[PDB]
Write a protein that binds this ligand. Structure first.
Ligand SMILES: Nc1ncnc2c1ncn2[C@@H]1O[C@H](COP(=O)(O)OP(=O)(O)OC[C@H]2O[C@@H](O)[C@H](O)[C@@H]2O)[C@@H](O)[C@H]1OP(=O)(O)O
Ligand SMILES: [Mg+2]
Length: 171
């Protein structure tokens, strides 16, 4: 036992790894330097990954997020900010993917993944792929084509994990 030690990930490419896991359980076990949040521009951590991370910090992430946004104003779609990882990680990189359910520009998903290249190693979810309504296969593709640093993707759903791995390791 040490820190940033990932286990049970499938190596997709030289720098992209994928596991069927809860990003919160992975954060707790690994204590990564950086865990990524699938955030909105307001850092209102209502559901999905954001709700699960915030709940595991006993709401400390939401209190910090409320203070940050009241001070700085909202993020841009495709942007990020580095805040505390609380009890889960050294840092949390809050990254805003486009909300395609509200017609936001899918091109901003590439801008969102570009934020990952500022960090050597990240534990991350598939951006925009849940509540934000992007195709998860497309989100994995943009991740693989954009991110050059080491990214460990945690995919909660068993069936989604199997679909992502089979489509990737065919195409
Ligand atoms: N605990 C978890 N660990 C790992 N992955 C997780 C976990 N919970 C959900 N996911 C997955 O992450 C992906 C991203 O889903 P969301 O967390 O909904 O992020 P997205 O970028 O789609 O939506 C962001 C919005 O979701 C709101 O919660 C947040 O405050 C913001 O407004 C989906 O494939 C989502 O899968 P699903 O569609 O919820 O089954
Ligand atoms: Mg699901």
């Amino acid at each position: 036992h040490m820190v940033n030690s990932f286990s049970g990930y499938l190596k997709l490419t030289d720098n992209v790894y994928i596991k069927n896991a809860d990003i919160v359980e992975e954060a707790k076990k690994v204590k990564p330097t950086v865990v990524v949040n699938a955030a909105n521009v307001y850092l209102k951590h209502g559901g999905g990954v954001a709700g699960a991370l915030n709940k595991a910090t006993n709401n400390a992430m939401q209190v910090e997020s409320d203070d940050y946004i009241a001070t700085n104003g909202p993020l841009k779609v495709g942007g990020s900010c580095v805040l505390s990882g609380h009890n889960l990680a050294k840092h949390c990189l809050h990254v805003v993917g486009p909300n395609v359910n509200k017609g936001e520009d899918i091109q901003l998903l590439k801008s969102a993944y570009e934020n990952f290249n500022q960090h050597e190693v990240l534990l991350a979810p598939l951006l925009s792929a849940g509540i934000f309504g992007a195709d998860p296969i497309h989100s994995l593709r943009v991740c693989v084509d954009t991110v050059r640093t080491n990214v460990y993707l945690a995919v909660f759903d068993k069936n989604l994990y199997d679909k992502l791995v089979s489509s990737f390791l065919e195409m």
